[PDB]
Design a protein around this nucleic acid. Structure first.
Ligand SMILES: [Mg+2]
Lengths: 41, 64, 332, 209, 113, 274
RNA sequence: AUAUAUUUUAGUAAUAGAUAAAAAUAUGUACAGUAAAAUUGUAAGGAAAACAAUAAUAACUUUCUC
């Protein structure tokens, strides 16, 4: 392999719902690798 | 080449049913170089043992 | 030889069975063959006697304000073999005066210890897991055991384990409490209250829940040996909210019925308190607020939980209540 | 103030202390319990299955009453495994010479020698001198303990060892004997009778058991 | 199946194992059990008392030593200093034996060196 | 499994809760290991420990005396150093490892009545190296250990791999026994009265053998093991014998104190100068 | 003491602890506990086999004691 040129796509993880925002039961709030945020109330 | 005793399926010792090792022992009489006798609990079957080479005759333990 | 004497010392400190006592002092295993088989360990006698002598001496030495005195007494007694025998091998729940007196401090102490070992812990666990405490009443510190029973309906005999599911049949008529106090408290002047609350009845306005007071006794007199709260004892003057049974609506979760026991504030005789029996709103009821008002200190608690079943309609009818609402199976 | 260098020369006990009665009883009980709970003696390892010594050993031992179909055993059925009734405690009987121990009471025999070292063998002894009467007082260039040692060494010609240069009490030194107005040796209890109460109180905690 | 050495090894192993060697666990009558418990308690108490005694004695000794040191420093400074001299290499006599069960033939030595 | 997320919900009481007691699962386990009812019961004080008695009566007081310095306060050893707050980066930073070493060190407390040096425990490890080839050797070693001591050893497995010596992980090699209380005292007495004397050219333990927090160690060759009573009585039974290391843990704060204590129990330290 | 019959033991095989960083079980649940390195030591044994030791007790509870 003279050149490299391989890579995966970005995973689009992060916050999907912000402080103050109205969720509905089931709505995803945060996507993450590991628990940078922990489940609360 | 590894010489081993190939294990059997071991016995399951249930939790709470583990009995501690109380080996069979005798109250042996140990006679030293001089007439001092001393009692010790030993697993070997013998009532009395007199000793020839002990601390009491060795020069290192006593400068007399 | 202080443990041999029984002038001032109550008669309960001895083993009431004579044979057993005799055996101890120089057995019980009933069957003859079994007895024959049995082989006790050697040199138990003399050594045991020596031990007794030692401990007796210690007790004598110990022997001489109230709480301190009680503590001293307890210390003196505890190591008595006889007392230990009495406590360990005779029932503590349905107590029998002469075998185990909870008037006697040592026995009381032992009981407390026993409670701490298991039942109390269990109760605590049930409270925590089922969210009884933070939901109804901030916290408690155990103090006294509280065992409930439902003798009248059905007719069977059972002490309810904390956090059980009772059928509507079983909890159709009122319960019986046994508040087993410890901790050297006054008996003549000290009064108690008992409240059976259920915090999870459906509030449709708020969409949350509201807490109903389904049974309320106040100004009950207790005694260390005599503590069963039967209709014999309390009288109709002491009931602030007369018993209403668990009647859970269909698909309204599992309703937690949590019996709280409080002791009165202490100021000559038994201090009572009025509680505006009419004014007090029982359908929706603030426990904490109530406590604040009358300055109660929750000593002990117990809990069970009820669910809907076919039987509840009948119960409602008997009690002359509405037909009961029905809720959607989905938590929408 | 004048510096008087005290010394409490001690004789260290030479045998295990005599027990209490209760303690002894307890020990016996414990031993019994151990015996009851002990494992079987594995004779098959120590002694061979066709040896003369083994045979001799066997001859001393008596076996356990085995079980036979048709008989009543009213003390429970014999649960025997590996040559032992599991039910009960199991015991084992046993220049070449029988070892006979020396008597632990020569002092008693003497019934007199308070100026003797071979007295109470299983007790800590202390040297005491007459004048009330007290510990060997001795009255500044040398170190104190060393000086004390020197002073007492002259009175006999004995062999002591100072535990340390650090003193105790009013200045008293500690030292331990290793070789052979009154040369008197006593136990901790015996001294109370042979000395003033105040003095005893002052130096009670020094004299060990 | 197995060599003689192997057999020997097995036997040795067994010597250590609890296989077939351990008896049935001792049961007790209730009263007996109680008695045992009481005895144990008594023993424990005795032990504690003994510990206290010894500990107390030690404390007293320490206090005495401290007092002596205080006196000594005040009085003869040189002497005090000498006393202090740290015993980093001190080592017990060796002739000062450990108590035996029964005493020797010569119950003490007179001549030495 | 959905979660994979450890998070204990906080409680609303100060009652402790020993869960095991609420379960009826292991009813034998509920009792202490010293309560007669438990199958784990064994008697402790079978007889009197002579060595311990000696320590208590004669030695302890002596130890207290000798160690005593005048007003020696704690010379607290080297710890983890906090960061100087002369920059904002120090703010949430972990502390600096001790000036001397990687590991943190204990404080040396003065030798008073409360904390006199004493014997804590004796650990014997017999790593038979020839057991890499023959696994029966390990068993034999263990048996020997048992015979010597009178309390069950535990197997020592090879924890590492290395080609130079024929060593591979997961291989039983030798036995390790932890001795405590009366048993340990007995063992020590046996070592001192019988074995160490009988060993031909023994000049005593080396004075450099200090663990440095009051631990002392020494070896025994394969020959010396024959001198133990339980082995000497039957030389026919023991063809191969295995050397061992002996570690002795003490309540001593420093090595010198520990060695002094050991000397009290008849341990010759003529091996060297400290 | 010795003979016969009938049975009982001896097949000898580990961990004896809710075991906790040698191997062997990779999915469920229940209960529990902490790793590693480095340093100082110790028969053969050292750079590199195994074992041991290496952070603070302020407050609290029980026990024993002046
Ligand atoms: Mg990426």
């Amino acid at each position: 392999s003279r050149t490299s040129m391989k890579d995966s796509a970005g995973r689009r993880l992060g916050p999907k719902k912000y402080e103050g925002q109205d969720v509905s039961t089931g709505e995803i709030i945060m996507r993450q690798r590991g628990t940078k945020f922990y489940p609360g109330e | 080449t590894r010489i081993t005793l190939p294990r059997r399926p071991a016995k399951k010792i249930q939790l709470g049913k583990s009995r501690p090792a109380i080996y069979h022992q005798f109250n042996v009489k140990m006679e030293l170089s001089d007439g001092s006798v001393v009692i010790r609990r030993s697993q070997y079957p013998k009532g009395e043992i007199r000793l020839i080479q002990d601390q009491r005759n060795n020069p290192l333990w006593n400068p007399s | 030889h202080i443990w041999s004497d029984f002038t001032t010392r109550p008669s309960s400190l001895s083993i009431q069975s004579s044979k057993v006592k005799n055996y101890l002092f120089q057995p019980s295993i009933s069957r003859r063959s079994n007895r024959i088989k049995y082989s006790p360990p050697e040199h138990i006698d003399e050594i045991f006697r020596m031990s007794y002598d030692f401990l007796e001496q210690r007790s004598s030495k110990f022997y001489e304000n109230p709480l301190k005195k009680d503590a001293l007494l307890i210390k003196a007694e505890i190591n008595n073999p006889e007392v230990q025998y009495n406590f360990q091998f005779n029932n503590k729940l349905n107590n029998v005066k002469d075998i185990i007196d909870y008037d006697v401090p040592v026995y009381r102490h032992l009981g407390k210890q026993h409670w701490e070992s298991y039942g109390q812990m269990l109760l605590m666990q049930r409270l925590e897991t089922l969210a009884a405490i933070p939901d109804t009443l901030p916290t408690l510190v155990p103090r006294a055991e509280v065992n409930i029973k439902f003798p009248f309906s059905t007719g069977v005999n059972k002490w309810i384990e904390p956090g059980e599911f009772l059928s509507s049949n079983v909890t159709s008529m009122r319960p019986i409490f046994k508040i087993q106090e410890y901790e050297l408290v006054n008996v003549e002047k000290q009064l108690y209250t008992v409240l059976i609350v259920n915090p999870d009845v459906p509030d449709l306005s708020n969409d949350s829940f509201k807490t109903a007071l389904c049974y309320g006794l106040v100004n009950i007199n207790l005694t260390y040996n005599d503590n069963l709260i039967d209709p014999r004892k309390f009288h109709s003057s002491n009931i602030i909210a007369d018993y209403l049974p668990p009647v859970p609506e269909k698909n309204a979760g599992k309703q937690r019925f949590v019996v709280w026991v409080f002791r009165q504030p202490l100021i000559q005789g038994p201090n009572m308190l009025e509680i505006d029996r009419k004014e007090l709103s029982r359908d929706d009821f603030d426990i904490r607020q109530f406590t604040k008002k009358y300055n109660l200190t929750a000593i002990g608690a117990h809990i069970w939980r009820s669910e809907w079943d076919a039987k509840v309609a009948a119960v409602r009818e008997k009690y002359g209540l509405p037909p009961g609402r029905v809720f959607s199976r989905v938590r929408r | 103030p004048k510096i008087k260098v005290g010394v409490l020369l001690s004789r260290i006990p030479i045998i295990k202390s005599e027990l209490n009665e209760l303690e002894k009883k307890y020990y016996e009980y414990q031993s019994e319990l151990e015996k009851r709970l002990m494992w079987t003696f594995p004779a098959y390892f120590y002694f061979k299955k066709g040896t003369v010594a083994e045979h001799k050993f066997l001859s001393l031992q008596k076996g356990p009453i085995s079980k036979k179909n048709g008989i009543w055993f009213p003390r429970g059925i014999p649960d025997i495994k590996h040559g032992r009734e599991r039910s009960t405690k199991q015991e084992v009987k046993l220049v070449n010479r029988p070892v006979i121990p020396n008597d632990r009471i020569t002092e008693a025999d003497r019934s007199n020698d308070m100026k003797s070292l071979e007295r109470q063998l299983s007790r800590t002894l202390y040297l005491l001198v007459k004048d009330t009467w007290k510990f060997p007082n001795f009255d500044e260039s040398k170190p104190l303990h060393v000086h004390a040692e020197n002073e007492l060494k002259l009175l006999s010609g004995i062999y002591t060892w100072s535990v340390s240069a650090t003193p105790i009490g009013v200045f008293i030194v500690k030292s331990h004997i290793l070789a052979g107005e009154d040369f008197a040796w006593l136990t901790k209890g015996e001294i109370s009778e042979y000395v003033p109460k105040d003095y005893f109180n002052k130096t009670e905690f020094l004299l060990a058991d | 199946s197995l060599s003689p050495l192997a057999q020997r090894v097995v036997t040795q192993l067994s010597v250590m194992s609890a296989s077939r060697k351990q008896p049935k666990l001792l049961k007790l009558a209730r009263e007996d059990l109680i008695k045992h418990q009481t005895i144990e308690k008594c023993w424990s108490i005795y032990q504690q008392q003994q510990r206290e005694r010894r500990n107390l004695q030690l404390e007293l000794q320490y206090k005495s030593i401290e007092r002596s040191m205080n006196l000594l420093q005040e009085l003869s400074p040189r002497l005090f200093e000498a006393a202090n001299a740290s015993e980093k290499g001190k080592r017990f006599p060796m002739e000062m034996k450990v108590p035996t069960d029964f005493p020797p033939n010569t119950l003490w030595h007179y001549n030495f060196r | 499994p959905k979660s994979a997320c450890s998070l204990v919900k906080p409680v609303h009481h100060l009652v402790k809760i020993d869960k095991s007691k609420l379960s009826p699962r292991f009813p034998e386990l509920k009792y202490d290991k010293s309560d007669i009812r438990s199958p784990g019961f064994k008697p402790k004080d079978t007889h009197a420990d002579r060595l311990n008695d000696h320590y208590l009566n004669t030695l302890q007081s002596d130890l207290l005396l000798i160690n005593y310095s005048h007003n020696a306060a704690v010379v607290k050893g080297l710890k983890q150093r906090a960061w100087s707050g002369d920059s904002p980066y120090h703010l949430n930073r972990p502390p600096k490892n001790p000036r001397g070493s990687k590991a943190q060190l204990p404080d040396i407390h003065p030798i008073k009545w409360s904390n006199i040096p004493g014997l804590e425990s004796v650990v014997i490890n017999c790593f038979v190296r020839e057991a890499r080839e023959n696994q029966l050797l390990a068993i034999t070693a263990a048996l020997q250990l048992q015979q010597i001591t009178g309390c069950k050893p535990h197997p020592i497995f090879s924890k590492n791999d290395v080609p130079t010596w024929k060593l591979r992980k997961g291989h039983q090699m030798g036995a390790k026994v932890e001795l405590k209380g009366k048993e340990m005292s007995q063992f020590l007495s046996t070592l001192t009265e019988i074995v160490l004397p009988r060993i031909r050219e023994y000049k005593g333990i080396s004075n450099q053998s200090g663990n440095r927090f009051g631990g002392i160690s020494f070896g025994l060759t394969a020959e010396d093991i024959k001198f133990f009573p339980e082995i000497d009585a039957n030389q026919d039974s023991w063809p191969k014998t295995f050397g061992m290391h002996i570690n002795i843990n003490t309540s001593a704060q420093l090595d010198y104190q520990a060695r002094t204590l050991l000397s009290g129990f008849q341990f010759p330290f003529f091996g060297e100068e400290k």
